[PDB]
Structures are given as structure tokens and as C-alpha cells.
């Protein structure tokens, strides 16, 4: 019924960096060839969602941020072939043309079409389907979910099961699938290894949900805030550290207690010295560490390459290393078939019109994931 | 006729850094227990014995280097299993002892008893078994080839096949095993790939043989010397670059020929900014690249992480990632059935006491490897 035709919803814009989300009345325009028009059900605060607040993430401003979310069809434009009007969808943030050379690729996923390499804040044509008081308001990373209507290319949704609960599932558009496939696919977690995690939010929790799934016999959680260690040990950490409590700094103390070095290491913060330090504290000759953190915008780390030549491999990956299209459905699937748990990561549930609240909650260390709902 | 006495013999001994070889009479003690004292047949000049006398690899001086060589057992101390005297035999510059947990992992070669790390420049007890004018002399890599006489402890000697011709498969001590083994088993480069080898001395060739092995589809050679050009087709690269004739820096020149980036690059040079740039010069999803080069003592890269969130894989190795023990011996036994060629390599065949010329020959560019003869 409102398919063909501009709709007129809240969205919540961000006009500036450092500011509070501003619940703004929104023009969404229908959606041209190969987009698809979405009524959000609901949507993840994710810490990648603040980065763009605080400046750690550059994109064009003013925008509608969110990338993690779920919601329903509204209207499909011409040529759309992979979803209908009313499909349960998920964004993607990071797309999956299926025709681009990573595309092809059998590990690659950092598709070509991606809006994050070197942000625009459109759809893939070059403009913005969002309108603010006459005003086009940006895109992000091609989902822009902090909305009651988004439109997103093709390319940026998978349709998944219709009986699965879209407050939950939502978590699987970034977080959950971030940390789960850092720690299966892009580290290759083997059973009986020693696992370290930086950072034990919502992606950290869910890269120890991964190295528990792949049989790690050791789970070491690393955060300055000790009131998340009660939940990375519920979800399978084996002991938790605290950096603030040792006079020494924590590769020292990680190698010791790993007894030489740990095989598996993971950097779920966003900061350069635990980029380093997680790099550090992996066994020298055969030690792997990923990269999940997003550091601070046209900032360099410094490092001692013998780290390296020693044998250690050092990799980072978005989404996890998914393939968004293929995956995202795939891991609904194996929700709904209780292969994992998304409850663990959720601790508030908020209506959307209470964003700047789930932020809060975000920044003051007190939640893991907020679920914003419509 | 020796065994059991202090031997007297020529060795080069380098007192200081930045001075020539002093070629002079050194004492060799009989070897202790599970100790094997060898007549060096041959021994090649590598880029890593050059960086002791630039100070670029920091180890204890006064010093007996050399480690890529070959020779024949004099005299074995007691409880030596491995080896026997007339035994052909090549010194392990990094050890197998079998015990530790780098040895006992699948993957790992950095065997814990090395003298890479920690620089001790002695046998494993800690003792010297040469004297120079009544000083005691450093050991270099618990191997100090460049010597008519070393001892070396059990773990870091291979027994060879017994017509192997020595003043050839010296080069498997380090240059050749290094290159081919970084391509094969290091960075696993896949048939139908595109590499990139930064550096076209003994071991980036044998970085280009191992490529090539492995069935890439296109091998790009880089150097800033084009007299190494020619060598490096001969060996299986599809083209050649200089850096110096472009205007663009290389990691873009690369990227465009690869169409976005190659599969497999390699730093075969021991420059950082050669780290970074071949880092960069992989495609930024897939890609992986390999430091094999030696950096200077104690000196930080700066790099951007968001080179390996996008996806790229980093790692580096010593001696081609081989276990070096298991693997000296096949691979003496895959070039006596010509596997893989080693005379491409050979460009210059000196007397021992011509140490000095050889070394020339490599700072000049000249040469590539310089076998010296006993
Ligand atoms: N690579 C990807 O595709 C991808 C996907 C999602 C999120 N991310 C990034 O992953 C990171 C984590 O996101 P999140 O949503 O879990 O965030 P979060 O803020 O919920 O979790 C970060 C955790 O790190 C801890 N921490 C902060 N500083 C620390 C320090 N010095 N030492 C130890 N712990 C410290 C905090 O106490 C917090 O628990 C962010 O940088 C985010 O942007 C990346
Ligand atoms: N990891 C290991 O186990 C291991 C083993 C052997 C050697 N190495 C190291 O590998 C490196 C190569 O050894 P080698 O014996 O082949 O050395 P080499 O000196 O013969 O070759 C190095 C080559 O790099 C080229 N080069 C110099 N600057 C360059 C620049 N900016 N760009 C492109 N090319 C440049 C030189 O012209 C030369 O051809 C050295 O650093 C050595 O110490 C490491
Ligand atoms: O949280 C996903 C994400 C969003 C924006 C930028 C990123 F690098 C990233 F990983
Ligand atoms: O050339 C072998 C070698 C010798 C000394 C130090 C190194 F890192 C190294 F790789
Ligand atoms: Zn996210
Ligand atoms: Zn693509
Ligand atoms: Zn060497
Ligand atoms: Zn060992």
C-alpha cells in the first residue's frame, strides 16, 4: 500500500560528532531497481555505531547510522530477484555482490561494493534515499537502521527464516556473527588451544562463544572492567584478567600463565597497544592473532616486525570473514536449530525512541548489547 | 688421528663491527657430550652473516659466523646417536631438539633452544669451544661456519646422504631452505596465483623456485638492482619491476597489475618500509605476505591496522618455517633426484681464505651466493 510511494517515519540523525542522536522526522523515497524498502523490527547499538559518535569512525555526516538489525520487506524495486514483500530480512554492512574478485574468492568476504574502505554514506548509485526538512541525509555502510524505514541495495540484505524472532537475530547482522566467525573461521580455533580475548563486550563474548564451539580447553578474558567477567565465564571463559591489578604489563603475565604464549588471540576493543599486546602475547614460533577492534581513524601502531619473523601470524577480518549473503541465513538456520545462544549478549531492551538511553547504557559500561525495538 | 685434541686451524674471526674477517689460527676443543665436531667442506656467504659485520643483526663479538654450509664429521663426544665420524652433515643454524612445545606442534620450527633471540653466541652450555690469541671466541647461531673446524650440539647437526656434493647442498643450510619453504609451507602459495617477491638474491630466487613449484600463474619479481633481473626469469619469474622507475610507489604499480592486489607477497630484503609495502601490495581481502628479511636491531615499523581488518593475513618465518632436523635430509635427498636446482644460485666459487673478496662480491651486487672452499 505504501509501496511506490515516499514514506514518512522517525529516524534517528546524527547532525553532528560528539552530540546526542536526534529524533528527526524523515522523508524515506521508494526504492529504485535492485533496492529493497525495510520496516525495522529491531536493532543492535553496536560499539562500531558510537565510533562514528566519537569520531573513531569517519563517515559523512549529517547520518542515519546502525548496521545491526532485522526487520520486514515493505516493497521491492524493479528487478529485485532474492527477496519479496513481507520476507523477514537482515542488512549486510558489508555486501555480497557475488561477482567482484573477492566475491569469488573461496575465503575472501570484504566485498568490492563495501561502503567502509572509503566511506560515501549513499546507496551504490551515489545518492541517499533520506531527507531530513528538504536536507539528503547519508547512509551507513549501506544499512542505516536507526530508522522505522530504510532502503538498502540488493546486494545488502538476505532474506531469512520467517518464524525466526527478529529481536534476537538482529545480533547475527553484526555482532554475534563478528565475534563467532573471528574466532571459527578467520583464527581456525583448534580443540584442546589457549585462547585470549581483549575486550569482553557484546563481539568479545561472542569470539569466546567461537573458541568454546571449536573445543579451546583454555579461555582467557582480558577487560579493565571487571563486572564483565561474570558473563564472559558463563558463556565459557576459563579465568579472567584484569590489566589494572598487575604491575606488569599483561603479555608478560599472559605468557606466564600460558606458559610460553597462548595459540589464539583476538582484539575485540579498538586500541593499538592491545593490538599490540594480543599480537605479543601468542606463542612466538607458531601463535595466530586477529584483529576485530576498530582503532581510532588515521592512526599507526608501532611494532617490532622479529615478532613475525619469529613465526607468528597476525590477520584481521570484518563480519567475522562471512560471506554476508550466503552466511547470514545459514547462521539463522543454526540458531533456530539452538547451535548457539543470542540471549547471553542481550541486557536491555529498549523502544527505538530511547536510543541516546541505549547509548548511555553503552558508554557507561553497565550493558553488553542493547536491542532497540519498533 | 684428531679426535680427542685440541684441533689448530684457520677460521675468520670478526673482532669488531664494520672490519674485515681476520683470518687467523683459532683452537677447536674436541666436542663434550652430544657434541659433533666437523671439517667444513663448503660455505655459503649469506645477506645474515653480512648484517653481523654491518651490526644490523646484533650478536656477541669477538665472533666465528657463518651458518649456511656443509661438511664431514671428524670426531662425535659421548652419547651422540645422530651422526658418525666420515658422516656428511649439515649445521642446524635453527635446532631441532624434539622436546620442547614449538617441536612437538605441527606447524612450529622455532625450536626453544635457539641463540636467535636471546644472542648467548655459545654452545647450549653455555661455553665456547674456540680460542683466539688465548681469548675465548663467540660461537654464531650454535653453528660458526666460517671455520676449517666447528663444534656443534647434537640438535643443531643433520646427517646427510653420503654422495651428496657438499660445495652444492650447503646452500640447503639456509638460503635455498629459507626462500623455497617461505613459498611452500609458509605462505602455502596456491596454483593458478599471483606473487610478489621483494628482493632477488639467493633467497628471494629461491622464494621464486618455490613459487613456481606451487604452479602460480604469475610471479612478479621487484628489485631495485635490474642486474638481478635476468637471473630471477631464468628461475620462474613472469616479470620484473624496479621501484626507481616509477613514479607511483610500488604497492600501487603492483596492485593495478594484479588487477587489486596479489595472492602472495614476500619481503626478502630486511628493509621496514619493504614490510609495509608488501604488505600493502597483497589484496587487502585474501592476500598474504611474508617477511623473510632481517630488519635492524631493535627498530619499530609503523603501520596502519586497517591494512589487516580488511582481511590481509601477516606472518614471517625462519628458515622457510622447515623443522630443520626432519627436513635437511629430504630435502638433500629431493635435490640429488632434481626436485628443485640449486647452480642458479651459484654465482661465484672462491677459496675460504678469498672470505673478505666474497664479501665484496655480495655489498658491490654482484653476486648472488659466493661458495667458499675449504
Ligand atoms: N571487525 C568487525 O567487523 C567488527 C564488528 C563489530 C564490532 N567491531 C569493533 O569491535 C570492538 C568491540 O565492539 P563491542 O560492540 O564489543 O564493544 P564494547 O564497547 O561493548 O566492548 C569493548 C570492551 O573492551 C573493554 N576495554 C576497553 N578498553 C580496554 C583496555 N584498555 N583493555 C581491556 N579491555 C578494554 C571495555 O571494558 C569493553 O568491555 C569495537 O572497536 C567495534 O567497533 C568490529
Ligand atoms: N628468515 C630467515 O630465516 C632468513 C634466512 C636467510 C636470510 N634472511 C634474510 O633475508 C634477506 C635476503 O637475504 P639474501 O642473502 O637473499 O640477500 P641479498 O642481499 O643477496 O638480496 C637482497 C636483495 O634486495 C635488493 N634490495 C635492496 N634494497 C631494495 C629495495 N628497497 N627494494 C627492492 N629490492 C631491494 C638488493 O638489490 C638485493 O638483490 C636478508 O635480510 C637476510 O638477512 C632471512
Ligand atoms: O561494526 C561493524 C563495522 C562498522 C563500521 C566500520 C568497521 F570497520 C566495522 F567493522
Ligand atoms: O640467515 C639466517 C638468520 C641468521 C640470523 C638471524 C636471523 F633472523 C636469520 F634469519
Ligand atoms: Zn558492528
Ligand atoms: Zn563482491
Ligand atoms: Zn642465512
Ligand atoms: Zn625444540
Not at 542522536?21 to 524515506?28: A, D, G, K, L, P
Not at 530477484?81 to 555480497?96: A, E, S, W
Not at 603479555?251 to 588471540?265: I, R, Y
Amino acid at each position: 500500500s505504501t509501496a511506490g510511494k515516499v514514506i514518512k517515519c522517525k529516524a534517528a540523525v546524527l547532525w553532528e560528532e560528539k552530540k546526542p542522536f536526534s529524533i528527526e522526522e524523515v522523508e524515506v523515497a521508494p526504492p529504485k531497481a535492485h533496492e529493497v524498502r525495510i520496516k525495522m523490527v529491531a536493532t543492535g547499538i553496536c560499539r562500531s555505531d558510537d565510533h562514528v559518535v566519537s569520531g573513531t569512525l569517519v563517515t559523512p555526516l549529517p547520518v542515519i547510522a546502525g548496521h545491526e538489525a532485522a526487520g520486514i520487506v515493505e516493497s521491492i524495486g524493479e528487478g529485485v530477484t532474492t527477496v519479496r514483500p513481507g520476507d523477514k530480512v537482515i542488512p549486510l554492512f558489508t555486501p555480497q555482490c557475488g561477482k567482484c574478485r573477492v566475491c569469488k574468492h573461496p575465503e575472501g568476504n570484504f566485498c568490492l561494493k563495501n561502503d567502509l574502505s572509503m566511506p560515501r554514506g549513499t546507496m551504490q548509485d551515489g545518492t541517499s534515499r533520506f531527507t531530513c526538512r528538504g536536507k539528503p541525509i547519508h547512509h551507513f555502510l549501506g544499512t542505516s537502521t536507526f530508522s522505522q524505514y530504510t532502503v538498502v541495495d540488493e546486494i545488502s540484505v538476505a532474506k531469512i527464516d520467517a518464524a525466526s524472532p527478529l529481536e534476537k537475530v538482529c545480533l547475527i547482522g553484526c555482532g554475534f556473527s563478528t565475534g563467532y566467525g573471528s574466532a571459527v573461521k578467520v583464527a581456525k580455533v583448534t580443540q584442546g588451544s589457549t585462547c585470549a580475548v581483549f575486550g569482553l563486550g557484546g563481539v568479545g563474548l561472542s569470539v569466546i562463544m567461537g573458541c568454546k564451539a571449536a573445543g579451546a580447553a583454555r579461555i582467557i578474558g582480558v577487560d579493565i572492567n571487571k563486572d564483565k567477567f561474570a558473563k564472559a565465564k558463563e558463556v565459557g571463559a576459563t579465568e579472567c584478567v584484569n590489566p589494572q591489578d598487575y604491575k606488569k604489563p599483561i603479555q608478560e603475565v599472559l605468557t606466564e600463565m600460558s606458559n610460553g604464549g597462548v595459540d589464539f588471540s583476538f582484539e575485540v576493543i579498538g586500541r593499538l597497544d592491545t593490538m599490540v599486546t594480543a599480537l605479543s602475547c601468542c606463542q612466538e614460533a607458531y601463535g595466530v592473532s586477529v584483529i576485530v577492534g576498530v582503532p581510532p581513524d588515521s592512526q599507526n601502531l608501532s611494532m617490532n616486525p622479529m615478532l613475525l619473523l619469529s613465526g607468528r601470524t597476525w590477520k584481521g577480518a570484518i563480519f567475522g570473514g562471512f560471506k554476508s549473503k550466503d552466511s547470514v541465513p545459514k547462521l539463522v538456520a543454526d540458531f533456530m536449530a539452538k547451535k548457539f545462544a543470542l540471549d547471553p549478549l542481550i541486557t536491555h531492551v529498549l523502544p527505538f525512541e530511547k536510543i541516546n538511553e541505549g547509548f548511555d547504557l553503552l558508554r557507561s559500561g553497565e550493558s553488553i548489547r542493547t536491542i532497540l525495538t519498533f
